[PDB]
A paper describes a structure:
Recently, PrpTA was found to be a pMBL6842-encoded type II TAS with the unique function to regulate the plasmid replication in Pseudoalteromonas rubra. It consists of stable PrpT toxin and labile PrpA antitoxin canonically positioned adjacently within the same operon. In this study, we reported for the first time the high-resolution structure of the PrpT:PrpA2:PrpT heterotetramer and two forms of crystal structures of truncated antitoxin-PrpA2–54. In addition, PrpA could also competitively bind to the iteron sequences in the ori, interfering with the binding of replication initiator RepB to the ori site, thus preventing the overreplication of the plasmid.
Overall with the crystal structure of the PrpTA complex, it was certain that the PrpTA biological assembly unit indicated with PrpT:PrpA2:PrpT contains two PrpT monomers, which were isolated from each other, and a PrpA homodimer. In other words, PrpT:PrpA2:PrpT heterotetramer is maintained by one single PrpAFL homodimer interface formed by N-terminal PrpARHH domains and two PrpT-PrpAFL heterodimer interfaces, which is similar to its structurally relevant complex, such as CvParDE, and consistent with the conclusion that PrpA dimer interface and PrpT-PrpA heterodimer interface with an estimated CSS (Complex Formation Significance Score, calculated by PISA server) value of 1 contribute to PrpTA heterotetramer complexation. PrpT toxin starts from a RHH fragment in the N-terminus, helices of which are connected by a single glycine residue, and the β1 tends to be packed with the EF-P OB-like fold that is mainly composed of C-terminal 3-stranded antiparallel β sheet (β3–β5), as shown in Figure 1Bb. PrpAFL begins with an extended conformation (β1) spanning from 5 to 9 aa, followed by the α 1 helix (11–23 aa) and the α 2 helix (30–45 aa). The C-terminal PrpT neutralizing domain (49–85 aa), which is also the tetramerization domain, is connected with the C-terminus of the α 2 helix by a hinge region composed of AGS triad [Figure 2B (upper)]. PrpT:PrpA2:PrpT heterotetramer is formed via a local twofold axis and highlights two extremely similar PrpT-PrpAFL contact interfaces. PrpA and PrpT interact via two hydrophobic subdomains surrounded by electrostatic interactions. The heterodimer interface dominated by a series of salt bridges/hydrogen bonds covers a surface of ∼2000 Å2 with an estimated ΔG value of −17 kcal/mol.
Residue numbers in the entry:
A (entry chain A), D (entry chain C): 2 to 96
B (entry chain D): 4 to 83
C (entry chain B): -5 to 86
Write the structure that this text describes.
């Protein structure tokens, strides 16, 4: 089983994302959204080729979209390490 | 998709005056003008801003295994 | 709030449009701002600052636009309020 | 009776002021606010000494507060001519 760890601030991002969705759409939508995020985490931990190279932000940084958000992460020997989960409005794609 | 915001009394009155003068049609138009200014202020340094957010993630402590069940339990424990 | 008194918090419900809505959402979810309201207040402060140095010119323009709006006519409170009632149903 | 006339734009100001008050507070409070403006109109038309000199904005311009608003007006031979009714946030007081 591939490993999946989160920086403390990424887990705090998820909490803010959950609360934002909860406040406007209620529990079921917020839980669904975190479920979509969780499913994408597992897919990224299993398949190195999905990761988008974000060296232009930081060397070795990877990105992947889910919904209106972007998982920013790094590859590890056994899986991934999630650094931040940010709204896509924060993105800076490669020039 | 609207949002309900508390501007505080000083900025609320500022918004009211601009609407009642006819310079802006609605509260929303005033708010959008302000948000456009805030977006423009940072539009040119999105890369530095993203780098800062990533760095703050990197510097936020040792990564820990993701535990979805604990997360959702913590979410319902907050004001059940 | 003391008993016999009431809350006087005053909110406004606004439509930012999708582009600026997503902009606000990202700033709140990143932790840069605590609430939608804080983002909107920063925007409003910038708008207030942009015009803070031209309040005399701005008021002169409002006054001139009043002067140029046509000849002045009599004022009648009851007719005004009647016309307000005719625009649609009124309550409270 | 002393004369009281309004520029068309001042009448449109009062409509916007009424509608803003109505949306917030309902009919009874919004019509009362207009009625208080009207009472101030009548008092200004009768008493020249109440008028605040606003020459520093435009020669001959006068101002007077009511509620959160300012009546901007000119003195005429028989009374006053209201030019604008503006929120006090638009004010430029004498320095």
């Amino acid at each position: 089983a591939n490993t999946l760890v989160l920086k403390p601030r990424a887990e705090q991002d998820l909490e803010r994302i959950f609360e934002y969705s909860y406040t406007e759409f209620g529990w079921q939508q917020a839980q669904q959204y975190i479920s979509d995020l969780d499913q994408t985490f597992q897919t990224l931990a299993a398949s190195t080729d999905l990761a988008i190279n974000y060296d232009h932000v930081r060397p070795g940084l990877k990105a992947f979209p889910v919904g209106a958000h972007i998982v920013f992460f790094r590859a590890t020997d056994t899986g991934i390490e999630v650094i931040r989960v940010l709204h896509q409005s924060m993105d800076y794609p490669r020039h | 998709r609207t949002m309900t915001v508390d501007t505080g009394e000083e900025l609320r009155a500022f918004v009211e005056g601009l609407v009642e003068s006819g310079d802006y049609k609605t509260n929303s138009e005033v708010i959008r003008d302000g948000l456009r200014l805030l977006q423009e202020k940072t539009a040119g340094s999105k890369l530095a801003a993203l780098r800062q957010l990533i760095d703050e993630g990197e510097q936020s402590g040792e990564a820990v295994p993701w535990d979805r069940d604990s997360f959702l339990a913590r979410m319902r424990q907050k004001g059940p």
